[PDB]
């Protein structure tokens, strides 16, 4: 089966936000609103903001999961390639097969779904701390889009779901991801291709 990717703000007005990092050659993570697409280097910090209109209940959680974007690949589990799943880059918590990690959150939990075999990482939803108006989760993507035997140049989407304590849906948002060596250049190229089309 294929998890839903339908945008759903829900009762709490849940949606994502992204920094404005630009497209310089030195950028390691950059988000294109025109493409709804995050470009990032391998295993680099990807800040993703969570915005709500009202505070969800204690025990609300935030889950991230990757799926293939293309119709003909949506049913295939997104995982790390045969090389990276055997890398000695464990953080002590993420299973080595998981593409998406949460960085610097000891309450992150990693799920291997017993029925779909899909991977996800989930953290407690925290209120913005004093001063701030949103919360930020720091994600890492642990394979390249181009990795042979893994994503194999196929685009993926990340689906972020707001869930209650039972895992029921409260809100949903999503974005395409390209994990690549040159995020700034590739974002420039793809935004140009979009402008030409
Ligand atoms: Zn890989």
mmCIF file of C-alpha atoms and ligand atoms in Angstrom:
data_model
loop_
_atom_site.group_PDB
_atom_site.id
_atom_site.type_symbol
_atom_site.label_atom_id
_atom_site.label_comp_id
_atom_site.label_asym_id
_atom_site.label_seq_id
_atom_site.Cartn_x
_atom_site.Cartn_y
_atom_site.Cartn_z
ATOM 1 C CA UNK A 1 0.000 0.000 0.000
ATOM 2 C CA UNK A 2 0.922 3.682 -0.330
ATOM 3 C CA UNK A 3 0.633 6.212 2.541
ATOM 4 C CA UNK A 4 -1.487 9.247 1.788
ATOM 5 C CA UNK A 5 0.287 12.464 0.829
ATOM 6 C CA UNK A 6 -2.780 14.722 0.923
ATOM 7 C CA UNK A 7 -2.126 18.063 2.611
ATOM 8 C CA UNK A 8 -4.329 18.344 5.692
ATOM 9 C CA UNK A 9 -4.015 21.208 8.152
ATOM 10 C CA UNK A 10 -6.558 19.665 10.536
ATOM 11 C CA UNK A 11 -7.981 21.181 13.705
ATOM 12 C CA UNK A 12 -4.668 22.699 14.807
ATOM 13 C CA UNK A 13 -3.712 24.387 11.533
ATOM 14 C CA UNK A 14 -0.631 22.229 11.061
ATOM 15 C CA UNK A 15 1.845 23.097 8.308
ATOM 16 C CA UNK A 16 5.589 23.082 7.636
ATOM 17 C CA UNK A 17 7.973 25.969 7.130
ATOM 18 C CA UNK A 18 11.459 26.288 5.688
ATOM 19 C CA UNK A 19 14.349 28.705 6.075
ATOM 20 C CA UNK A 20 15.489 30.955 3.210
ATOM 21 C CA UNK A 21 18.989 29.585 2.697
ATOM 22 C CA UNK A 22 19.672 30.735 -0.880
ATOM 23 C CA UNK A 23 21.454 28.896 -3.683
ATOM 24 C CA UNK A 24 25.142 29.736 -3.222
ATOM 25 C CA UNK A 25 27.647 26.978 -3.973
ATOM 26 C CA UNK A 26 28.408 26.688 -0.243
ATOM 27 C CA UNK A 27 24.798 25.988 0.799
ATOM 28 C CA UNK A 28 24.196 22.515 2.283
ATOM 29 C CA UNK A 29 20.382 22.583 2.525
ATOM 30 C CA UNK A 30 17.983 24.777 0.581
ATOM 31 C CA UNK A 31 14.235 24.745 0.009
ATOM 32 C CA UNK A 32 12.449 25.731 -3.207
ATOM 33 C CA UNK A 33 8.869 26.949 -2.639
ATOM 34 C CA UNK A 34 8.226 26.965 -6.389
ATOM 35 C CA UNK A 35 9.086 23.256 -6.623
ATOM 36 C CA UNK A 36 8.008 22.339 -3.053
ATOM 37 C CA UNK A 37 11.359 20.598 -2.965
ATOM 38 C CA UNK A 38 14.201 20.430 -0.439
ATOM 39 C CA UNK A 39 17.758 20.089 -1.789
ATOM 40 C CA UNK A 40 20.352 18.843 0.672
ATOM 41 C CA UNK A 41 23.760 17.225 0.954
ATOM 42 C CA UNK A 42 24.236 13.760 2.405
ATOM 43 C CA UNK A 43 23.756 13.533 6.189
ATOM 44 C CA UNK A 44 23.640 17.314 6.627
ATOM 45 C CA UNK A 45 21.228 19.131 8.932
ATOM 46 C CA UNK A 46 17.848 19.926 7.356
ATOM 47 C CA UNK A 47 15.836 22.303 9.571
ATOM 48 C CA UNK A 48 12.096 21.864 9.096
ATOM 49 C CA UNK A 49 9.743 24.187 10.960
ATOM 50 C CA UNK A 50 6.430 23.065 12.429
ATOM 51 C CA UNK A 51 3.703 25.704 12.592
ATOM 52 C CA UNK A 52 0.305 25.414 14.278
ATOM 53 C CA UNK A 53 -2.566 27.833 14.874
ATOM 54 C CA UNK A 54 -3.373 26.271 18.250
ATOM 55 C CA UNK A 55 -1.488 23.973 20.587
ATOM 56 C CA UNK A 56 -2.206 20.248 20.108
ATOM 57 C CA UNK A 57 -2.768 18.015 23.161
ATOM 58 C CA UNK A 58 0.089 16.615 25.254
ATOM 59 C CA UNK A 59 1.248 13.382 23.664
ATOM 60 C CA UNK A 60 0.874 14.631 20.083
ATOM 61 C CA UNK A 61 3.758 13.416 17.900
ATOM 62 C CA UNK A 62 5.348 14.266 14.552
ATOM 63 C CA UNK A 63 6.285 11.476 12.127
ATOM 64 C CA UNK A 64 8.448 11.612 8.997
ATOM 65 C CA UNK A 65 8.354 8.986 6.244
ATOM 66 C CA UNK A 66 9.740 8.852 2.695
ATOM 67 C CA UNK A 67 7.923 7.457 -0.353
ATOM 68 C CA UNK A 68 8.814 7.412 -4.033
ATOM 69 C CA UNK A 69 7.132 10.241 -5.924
ATOM 70 C CA UNK A 70 6.635 8.447 -9.251
ATOM 71 C CA UNK A 71 3.467 6.397 -9.731
ATOM 72 C CA UNK A 72 5.386 3.320 -10.918
ATOM 73 C CA UNK A 73 7.552 3.230 -7.762
ATOM 74 C CA UNK A 74 5.190 4.357 -4.977
ATOM 75 C CA UNK A 75 4.748 0.825 -3.642
ATOM 76 C CA UNK A 76 8.495 0.243 -3.097
ATOM 77 C CA UNK A 77 9.864 0.866 0.405
ATOM 78 C CA UNK A 78 12.361 3.742 0.458
ATOM 79 C CA UNK A 79 15.503 2.544 2.253
ATOM 80 C CA UNK A 80 19.225 3.141 2.355
ATOM 81 C CA UNK A 81 21.259 1.521 -0.410
ATOM 82 C CA UNK A 82 23.382 -1.628 0.122
ATOM 83 C CA UNK A 83 26.467 0.531 0.685
ATOM 84 C CA UNK A 84 25.162 3.096 3.155
ATOM 85 C CA UNK A 85 23.129 0.631 5.214
ATOM 86 C CA UNK A 86 26.479 -0.990 6.064
ATOM 87 C CA UNK A 87 28.258 2.265 6.912
ATOM 88 C CA UNK A 88 29.633 2.784 10.394
ATOM 89 C CA UNK A 89 27.623 5.990 10.798
ATOM 90 C CA UNK A 90 25.204 4.814 13.494
ATOM 91 C CA UNK A 91 23.952 7.492 15.879
ATOM 92 C CA UNK A 92 23.053 4.911 18.531
ATOM 93 C CA UNK A 93 19.327 5.141 17.806
ATOM 94 C CA UNK A 94 18.481 5.072 14.097
ATOM 95 C CA UNK A 95 18.473 1.627 12.468
ATOM 96 C CA UNK A 96 21.122 1.547 9.733
ATOM 97 C CA UNK A 97 18.492 0.876 7.037
ATOM 98 C CA UNK A 98 16.551 4.114 7.662
ATOM 99 C CA UNK A 99 16.956 6.958 5.170
ATOM 100 C CA UNK A 100 15.552 9.695 7.463
ATOM 101 C CA UNK A 101 17.019 10.431 10.888
ATOM 102 C CA UNK A 102 16.164 13.050 13.482
ATOM 103 C CA UNK A 103 19.257 14.836 14.772
ATOM 104 C CA UNK A 104 19.749 15.658 18.463
ATOM 105 C CA UNK A 105 16.491 14.364 19.950
ATOM 106 C CA UNK A 106 16.838 11.532 22.467
ATOM 107 C CA UNK A 107 13.069 10.927 22.343
ATOM 108 C CA UNK A 108 13.113 10.078 18.639
ATOM 109 C CA UNK A 109 11.686 6.640 17.905
ATOM 110 C CA UNK A 110 12.231 4.631 14.741
ATOM 111 C CA UNK A 111 9.510 2.374 13.371
ATOM 112 C CA UNK A 112 9.721 -0.614 11.035
ATOM 113 C CA UNK A 113 6.058 -1.095 10.135
ATOM 114 C CA UNK A 114 5.162 -4.746 10.707
ATOM 115 C CA UNK A 115 2.680 -4.761 7.788
ATOM 116 C CA UNK A 116 4.018 -2.340 5.160
ATOM 117 C CA UNK A 117 7.721 -2.647 6.113
ATOM 118 C CA UNK A 118 8.035 1.114 5.661
ATOM 119 C CA UNK A 119 10.402 3.124 7.848
ATOM 120 C CA UNK A 120 9.567 6.248 9.798
ATOM 121 C CA UNK A 121 10.940 8.383 12.613
ATOM 122 C CA UNK A 122 8.654 10.048 15.162
ATOM 123 C CA UNK A 123 9.253 12.618 17.917
ATOM 124 C CA UNK A 124 7.011 14.294 20.507
ATOM 125 C CA UNK A 125 5.459 17.555 19.310
ATOM 126 C CA UNK A 126 6.938 20.300 21.450
ATOM 127 C CA UNK A 127 5.506 23.798 21.916
ATOM 128 C CA UNK A 128 7.642 26.710 20.726
ATOM 129 C CA UNK A 129 9.895 27.817 23.522
ATOM 130 C CA UNK A 130 9.590 31.280 25.067
ATOM 131 C CA UNK A 131 10.203 33.884 22.385
ATOM 132 C CA UNK A 132 9.768 31.697 19.303
ATOM 133 C CA UNK A 133 6.639 31.139 17.223
ATOM 134 C CA UNK A 134 7.407 27.687 15.803
ATOM 135 C CA UNK A 135 9.344 24.548 16.590
ATOM 136 C CA UNK A 136 12.117 23.111 14.419
ATOM 137 C CA UNK A 137 13.008 19.476 13.793
ATOM 138 C CA UNK A 138 16.469 18.751 12.381
ATOM 139 C CA UNK A 139 16.370 15.929 9.829
ATOM 140 C CA UNK A 140 19.211 14.070 8.106
ATOM 141 C CA UNK A 141 18.943 12.142 4.830
ATOM 142 C CA UNK A 142 21.451 9.284 4.885
ATOM 143 C CA UNK A 143 21.679 8.296 1.184
ATOM 144 C CA UNK A 144 22.050 10.176 -2.067
ATOM 145 C CA UNK A 145 19.132 10.307 -4.492
ATOM 146 C CA UNK A 146 21.541 8.713 -6.989
ATOM 147 C CA UNK A 147 22.612 5.745 -4.818
ATOM 148 C CA UNK A 148 22.597 2.529 -6.835
ATOM 149 C CA UNK A 149 20.504 -0.209 -5.291
ATOM 150 C CA UNK A 150 18.748 2.477 -3.236
ATOM 151 C CA UNK A 151 16.832 5.491 -4.500
ATOM 152 C CA UNK A 152 18.646 4.950 -7.826
ATOM 153 C CA UNK A 153 17.952 8.515 -9.087
ATOM 154 C CA UNK A 154 14.205 8.253 -8.346
ATOM 155 C CA UNK A 155 12.701 11.318 -6.634
ATOM 156 C CA UNK A 156 11.175 10.894 -3.190
ATOM 157 C CA UNK A 157 8.689 12.800 -1.070
ATOM 158 C CA UNK A 158 8.920 13.246 2.680
ATOM 159 C CA UNK A 159 5.513 13.053 4.381
ATOM 160 C CA UNK A 160 5.269 14.760 7.772
ATOM 161 C CA UNK A 161 2.259 13.728 9.854
ATOM 162 C CA UNK A 162 0.966 15.189 13.092
ATOM 163 C CA UNK A 163 -0.457 12.294 15.131
ATOM 164 C CA UNK A 164 -2.247 11.832 18.409
ATOM 165 C CA UNK A 165 -0.870 9.485 21.050
ATOM 166 C CA UNK A 166 -2.501 6.468 19.316
ATOM 167 C CA UNK A 167 -1.032 7.356 15.924
ATOM 168 C CA UNK A 168 -4.287 8.719 14.485
ATOM 169 C CA UNK A 169 -3.997 11.471 11.891
ATOM 170 C CA UNK A 170 -4.197 15.090 13.066
ATOM 171 C CA UNK A 171 -2.450 16.858 10.172
ATOM 172 C CA UNK A 172 -0.275 16.193 7.153
ATOM 173 C CA UNK A 173 2.202 18.061 4.943
ATOM 174 C CA UNK A 174 4.848 16.949 2.451
ATOM 175 C CA UNK A 175 7.741 18.026 0.243
ATOM 176 C CA UNK A 176 9.946 16.508 -2.432
ATOM 177 C CA UNK A 177 13.592 15.814 -1.516
ATOM 178 C CA UNK A 178 16.738 15.588 -3.627
ATOM 179 C CA UNK A 179 19.851 14.474 -1.737
ATOM 180 C CA UNK A 180 22.773 15.616 -3.860
ATOM 181 C CA UNK A 181 26.338 16.937 -3.839
ATOM 182 C CA UNK A 182 25.379 20.451 -5.022
ATOM 183 C CA UNK A 183 22.004 21.570 -3.605
ATOM 184 C CA UNK A 184 22.439 25.230 -4.536
ATOM 185 C CA UNK A 185 23.300 24.546 -8.170
ATOM 186 C CA UNK A 186 20.601 21.896 -8.530
ATOM 187 C CA UNK A 187 17.918 24.142 -7.037
ATOM 188 C CA UNK A 188 18.954 26.882 -9.473
ATOM 189 C CA UNK A 189 18.863 24.442 -12.400
ATOM 190 C CA UNK A 190 15.477 22.962 -11.547
ATOM 191 C CA UNK A 191 13.883 26.365 -10.897
ATOM 192 C CA UNK A 192 15.194 27.461 -14.295
ATOM 193 C CA UNK A 193 13.789 24.320 -15.934
ATOM 194 C CA UNK A 194 10.434 25.103 -14.305
ATOM 195 C CA UNK A 195 10.534 28.695 -15.572
ATOM 196 C CA UNK A 196 11.236 27.449 -19.108
ATOM 197 C CA UNK A 197 8.428 24.867 -18.999
HETATM 198 ZN ZN1 LIG B 1 23.407 5.250 -0.381
#
